[PDB]
Design a binder for this molecule. Structure first.
Ligand code: CL
Length: 439
C-alpha cells in the first residue's frame, strides 16, 4: 500500500478542507472545458453559415477569434494583471510567501479570460488557467474557514494547484509530482501535506472522469517496445531537447519584452495587439489547423506517422512562432500543453530520420514521438519526472518508461550545462525583480 508510505500527521480538518478544494477545482476545470468547447463550437457555427462566401468566411474566422481574445486580454488588464500568462509562477511565488492570491479578482478573470483566449483557438493550454484557478480556490476555502498558520496556507494552496493540473490532464500522479518537483521552493522551506495533495488530486480527477465519458484526451493506441540496442538513440533525442529548451526560454522571455514595446503598457493598444494575435490564430485555425489551436489535435496524427517530414518541419516552425506569440503577449493561457505538441513534433521528426538512417534496428517513429512529448517539459520547465509520468499517464504506453527517462535525463543535463533555468522560476524572478525595483 502507498497509504503506509505516508503515515505522517497533519490536522484532519485540513484534510477535509483539501477534499473541498479538490471537488471545487474539479468542477471548475470541467466547467472551463465546456466553456471552451462551447465557444469553439459556436465559432464553427458562423463558419458554416458563411461557407458560401470565402473571403467573409476568413474575415469571420478572424473577427470572432479577435473579439473573443480582446475580451480576455481586457479582463486581465482591467481587473487582474497577474491572471495574464500561465499564472503558474504566481502560485509558485505564493508558495514562497512572496506573491498575493487575490482570488476575488483572479477567479472570475482567469476563468472568463481564458474562456475568451482558449475559446478563440489561441495556442494556449488549459494548465495555466486550471492551476492558477485551482491554487486561488485553495486560498479561497482557506479564507472562508478563517484558517490559521503556514501549514493550512501552503497545503491548501498546493492542493489547489496539484488538483488543477490533475484535472487538466486526467493525470493524478502528474499533479502530485508537479508540486514536489517544480512548485515548492527549497532552502526557503515550506509545509505541504502529501495526504492533502493526494486527496485533492483524487477528488478533481474523478470530477473529470464523471463529466468526460470514458475518453482519453490522447488516443495513441498501443505501440511497440524499445529494444536495448535502441536505448542510446533516446539519449541523442534528449541532448537535442537539452540544447533547444534553454534557447526557447530566452525566446519566450525576449518575446515578452519585444511585445511589451508595441503597447508599452497601454490597455487599448495591449487589447488591440491581443486581438490581432487573437484573430490571426482563428484565421490560421481554418487555413492551417495544425499551426494554431491547442495541440491535442495533431499529437495523435503525428504519432501514427500521418504527417510527412517536410510537413513536420513546417508545423514545428509555425507553432514555435504562434506559441511565442500567443503566450508571451500575456493572454490567460498556458505554455505547458503547447510544449507537449512541440515536443511530439520534434520527437516524431527524430523518429523518421532514425528509421531510415538505421534500417537494422526495428524502430517505430511513434516511440520517438512519445519520448519527445515530455522532453521540452524536461528542458524548459525543468520538471522531467512530471513530464515523463504525465506522458505515461496520458498515452498509457507504460512499456516506454526507460527510453523516456533516458530522453529526459539527457534533456535536463544538457539544459543545465548550457546555463538555462526553469522557465517558471525565470518568469517569477523577473516578477519579483520589478516588485523589488519599487523598493
Ligand atoms: Cl503554463
Amino acid at each position: 500500500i502507498r497509504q503506509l508510505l505516508e503515515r505522517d500527521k497533519t490536522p484532519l480538518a485540513i484534510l477535509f478542507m483539501a477534499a473541498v478544494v479538490g471537488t471545487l477545482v474539479g468542477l471548475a476545470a470541467v466547467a472551463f472545458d465546456k466553456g471552451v468547447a462551447w465557444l469553439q463550437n459556436q465559432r464553427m457555427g458562423a463558419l458554416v453559415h458563411t461557407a458560401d462566401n470565402y473571403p467573409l468566411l476568413l474575415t469571420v474566422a478572424f473577427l470572432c477569434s479577435a473579439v473573443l481574445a480582446m475580451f480576455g486580454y481586457f479582463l486581465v488588464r482591467k481587473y487582474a494583471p497577474e491572471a495574464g500568462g500561465s499564472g503558474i509562477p504566481e502560485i509558485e511565488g505564493a508558495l514562497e510567501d512572496q506573491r498575493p492570491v487575490r482570488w476575488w479578482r483572479v477567479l472570475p478573470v482567469k476563468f472568463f479570460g481564458g474562456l475568451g483566449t482558449l475559446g478563440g483557438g489561441m495556442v494556449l493550454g488549459r494548465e495555466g488557467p486550471t492551476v492558477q484557478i485551482g491554487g486561488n480556490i485553495g486560498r479561497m476555502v482557506l479564507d472562508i474557514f478563517r484558517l490559521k498558520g503556514d501549514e493550512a496556507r501552503h497545503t491548501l494552496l498546493a492542493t489547489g494547484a496539484a488538483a488543477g493540473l490533475a484535472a487538466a490532464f486526467n493525470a493524478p500522479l502528474a499533479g502530485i509530482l508537479f508540486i514536489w518537483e517544480e512548485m515548492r521552493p527549497q532552502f526557503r522551506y515550506t509545509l505541504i501535506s502529501i495526504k492533502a495533495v493526494f486527496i485533492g488530486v483524487i477528488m478533481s480527477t474523478i470530477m473529470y472522469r464523471i463529466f468526460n465519458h470514458e475518453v482519453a484526451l490522447i488516443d495513441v493506441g498501443k505501440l511497440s517496445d524499445a529494444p536495448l540496442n535502441t536505448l542510446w538513440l533516446y539519449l541523442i533525442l534528449g541532448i537535442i531537447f537539452g540544447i533547444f529548451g534553454p534557447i526557447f526560454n530566452k525566446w519566450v522571455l525576449g518575446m515578452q519584452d519585444l511585445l511589451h514595446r508595441v503597447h508599452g503598457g497601454n490597455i487599448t493598444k495591449w487589447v488591440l495587439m491581443g486581438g490581432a494575435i487573437g484573430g490571426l490564430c482563428g484565421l490560421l485555425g481554418f487555413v492551417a489547423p495544425a499551426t494554431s489551436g491547442g495541440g491535442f489535435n495533431l499529437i495523435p496524427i503525428a504519432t501514427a506517422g500521418n504527417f510527412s517530414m517536410g510537413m513536420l518541419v513546417f508545423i514545428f516552425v509555425a507553432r514555435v512562432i504562434t506559441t511565442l506569440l500567443c503566450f508571451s503577449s500575456g493572454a490567460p493561457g498556458g505554455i505547458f500543453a503547447p510544449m507537449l505538441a512541440l515536443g511530439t513534433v520534434l520527437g516524431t521528426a527524430f523518429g523518421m530520420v532514425a528509421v531510415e538512417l538505421f534500417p537494422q534496428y526495428h524502430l517505430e517513429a511513434g516511440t520517438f514521438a512519445i519520448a519527445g512529448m515530455g522532453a521540452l517539459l524536461a528542458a524548459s520547465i525543468r520538471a522531467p519526472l512530471t513530464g515523463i509520468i504525465l506522458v505515461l499517464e496520458m498515452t498509457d504506453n507504460y512499456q516506454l518508461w526507460l527510453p523516456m527517462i533516458i530522453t529526459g535525463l539527457g534533456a535536463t543535463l544538457l539544459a543545465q550545462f548550457t546555463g538555462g533555468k526553469p522557465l517558471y522560476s525565470a518568469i517569477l524572478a523577473r516578477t519579483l525583480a520589478k516588485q523589488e525595483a519599487e523598493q
